[PDB]
Design an enzyme around this catalytic site. Sequence first.
Site, PDB file in Angstrom:
ATOM      1  N   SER A   1       0.997  -2.712   5.071  1.00  0.00           N
ATOM      2  CA  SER A   1       0.626  -1.390   5.656  1.00  0.00           C
ATOM      3  C   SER A   1       1.755  -0.383   5.547  1.00  0.00           C
ATOM      4  CB  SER A   1       0.289  -1.542   7.128  1.00  0.00           C
ATOM      5  OG  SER A   1      -0.732  -2.498   7.302  1.00  0.00           O
ATOM      6  N   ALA A  69       2.009  -3.696  11.032  1.00  0.00           N
ATOM      7  CA  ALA A  69       2.459  -4.941  11.644  1.00  0.00           C
ATOM      8  C   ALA A  69       3.981  -4.942  11.652  1.00  0.00           C
ATOM      9  CB  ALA A  69       1.915  -6.137  10.877  1.00  0.00           C
ATOM     10  N   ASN A 241       6.150  -2.397   6.411  1.00  0.00           N
ATOM     11  CA  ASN A 241       6.430  -3.732   6.947  1.00  0.00           C
ATOM     12  C   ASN A 241       7.888  -4.152   6.693  1.00  0.00           C
ATOM     13  OD1 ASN A 241       3.278  -4.232   5.599  1.00  0.00           O
ATOM     14  ND2 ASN A 241       3.552  -4.330   7.840  1.00  0.00           N
TER      15      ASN A 241
HETATM   16  C1  LIG Z   1      -2.549  -5.082   8.353  1.00  0.00           C
HETATM   17  C2  LIG Z   1      -1.468  -5.351   9.399  1.00  0.00           C
HETATM   18  C3  LIG Z   1      -0.136  -5.314   8.699  1.00  0.00           C
HETATM   19  O1  LIG Z   1       0.603  -4.206   8.649  1.00  0.00           O
HETATM   20  O2  LIG Z   1       0.244  -6.334   8.141  1.00  0.00           O
HETATM   21  C4  LIG Z   1      -1.560  -4.449  10.583  1.00  0.00           C
HETATM   22  C5  LIG Z   1      -1.560  -5.008  11.864  1.00  0.00           C
HETATM   23  C6  LIG Z   1      -1.673  -4.210  13.004  1.00  0.00           C
HETATM   24  C7  LIG Z   1      -1.801  -2.830  12.871  1.00  0.00           C
HETATM   25  C8  LIG Z   1      -1.802  -2.255  11.589  1.00  0.00           C
HETATM   26  C9  LIG Z   1      -1.689  -3.069  10.450  1.00  0.00           C
END
Ligand SMILES: C[C@@H](C(=O)O)c1ccccc1
Lengths: 557, 206
Positions: A1, A69, A241
């Site tokens: 993300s 995330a 991330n």
């Molecule tokens: C898809 C996941 C992630 O970034 O891995 C996520 C989790 C919680 C909120 C946004 C994206």
Amino acid sequence: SNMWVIGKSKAQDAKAIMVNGPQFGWYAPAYTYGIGLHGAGYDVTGNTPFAYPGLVFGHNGVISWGSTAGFGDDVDIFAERLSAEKPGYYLHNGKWVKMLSREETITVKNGQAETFTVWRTVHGNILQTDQTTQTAYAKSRAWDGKELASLLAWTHQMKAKNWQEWTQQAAKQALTINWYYADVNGNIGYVHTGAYPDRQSGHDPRLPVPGTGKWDWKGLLPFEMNPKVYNPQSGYIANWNNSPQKDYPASDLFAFLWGGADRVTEIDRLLEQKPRLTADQAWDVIRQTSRQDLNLRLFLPTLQAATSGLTQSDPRRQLVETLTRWDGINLLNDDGKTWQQPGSAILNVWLTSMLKRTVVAAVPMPFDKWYSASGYETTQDGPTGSLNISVGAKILYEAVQGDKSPIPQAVDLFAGKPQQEVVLAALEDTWETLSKRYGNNVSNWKTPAMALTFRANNFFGVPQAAAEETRHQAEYQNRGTENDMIVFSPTTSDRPVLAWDVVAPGQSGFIAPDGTVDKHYEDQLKMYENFGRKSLWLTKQDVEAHKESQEVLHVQR
Amino acid sequence: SSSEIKIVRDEYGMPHIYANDTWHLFYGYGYVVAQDRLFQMEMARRSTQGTVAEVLGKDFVKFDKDIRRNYWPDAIRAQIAALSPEDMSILQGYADGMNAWIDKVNTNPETLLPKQFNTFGFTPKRWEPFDVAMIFVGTMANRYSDSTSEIDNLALLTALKDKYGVSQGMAVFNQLKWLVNPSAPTTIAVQESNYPLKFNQQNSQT
Ligand SMILES: C[C@@H](C(=O)O)c1ccccc1
Ligand SMILES: [Ca+2]
């Protein structure tokens, strides 16, 4: 993300811009749900996964919010001590304590039901695997018992009107999630939210700990510790991330690393390239990052050094010149099947070869397999998620950085061989492989493009629609399952805020008994494909001016 | 009217709920969710509680068992029972709104039952706050906040120490799976702040 929040010092024709691309995989019907709530203290618009009561992506006309995330380490494993003489008990703080247990029955369509027991200790539920007469492992989450609190925190934050009111809700969200803020005045913020354990001295959080008591967590760290920033000097907040903050430790997953090599650099580069960005340019960052090969930038210099002194007719050298002339932005040919340039195929073959000659060669089987993926692996349906730099590639990158790497190379991944020789040998493999497949005229190489599939089975692998409902998109795009942008104080609008999103294939998943598909079943699919977007309404007058239907319910609790 | 819930859908079918109190607001939300994504939400409920095999058969038994071993229903229920009336109103309203549509669906399935239900051979049932809570628990907390490979990690470290010896083995683990790496690009710049905690990276718990 991914996520980029651009503040006042860097926003053009606006005060703040937020662009979120959460990468959940692709499904039909849509992974998220568009919803607007007006009353009882709420006034919001946006869309959210599985229609959670709380909107993960949205705004309230004063502030806007988003997530990616966090991947912090909020789970440790406790090795419980058992005894054959006391089945169902474990040793803890000097005494044999009774495990929690429950019976479950799996009822089965056209099959025989199955009954089994689930076990839990003071550290968490017991894992099925790795079981011995003496040992069982419990999975300990810092968020245990805070599930509901996180769900409510995500809901209540929607009513916040400033940074202080918002961080108050952020402090109650216990899952490891990056939260982002922006507001009408151009302020921007970020919090790596979540509960994190206050570990005993000497506790290496990457490895399990005894469950007999001396290693129990002290409690949970306070909110003061959670990485956060409000109005950073840089004038922007970007995440993919990647690590939240200097010296902040990542998730214990062996396949997960925050190191010199990180895809987030691809976003930082585009935001720094232009002093200020408009909403349109910030949106354009989606299209560009979704096509950017993520390994080019990392290994190109190494590739150049190794071939810098070779004659012009050297085919290894020429694969590198090819890469050097490339922006790394993949485009489809007219055929809708292949890529205009062969760079990713080249890097893929070369990287696969490098890993097998280096990291893979230094790790004992079968752990060696963990480090052999190049990060281009996929099926005919295309990636199930985002594309990233592989774990082996990240390690390889520290190695080719030599002394510029802060990671001590305990063992030489190159095993005494000069780096150049090993890089060349891998270029030789690439040329042999690729020339045998596509011929010797590189300029006419039509290598396979990745495609994208909106799957009918949800992430669990469980059907959430009939198989025939699967949707296909010619061009894979390393982008959010949905993309939303909120623009605060746009200078060319009559509103203090403008907002857009795209929920593909469409708002509705409804199909009538006779097979008649809803009017909103697939009306956002082509929009997704071409980096399009539709307006999200907030005010009564905007919603009213764009109304298609209306229904009034009269009900008492 | 305190009992009035207005639902207005825009040019893309996106619903906007208008209501006076907490319960009515989320009732409207649940109502539109049931109109739009009932089958998707039904199967989601089943995935998060491990009851897919009840409708899809033996290929989903292992899956169901794994789901159930990964949470503790009673703890989730107790969290709900401790909720204030206002917070509860969120989950109860949402469940009630869904139930209102589901009742209408099972009353006139010849025109309202999503085709998928006829196809997979079952009909939708009513929802409770627990179900709503588990959608979130099962698809957010369990998918994105429940990651660890410590057992595998110790296995890797153990092999490294066997191959390279104890001291060097530890050093190689810290090379393939570093705790922190100062060159990691960070969302918050070093000028702003740093994380003040230092961690043991020698597996000193042994
Ligand atoms: C898809 C996941 C992630 O970034 O891995 C996520 C989790 C919680 C909120 C946004 C994206
Ligand atoms: Ca851990």
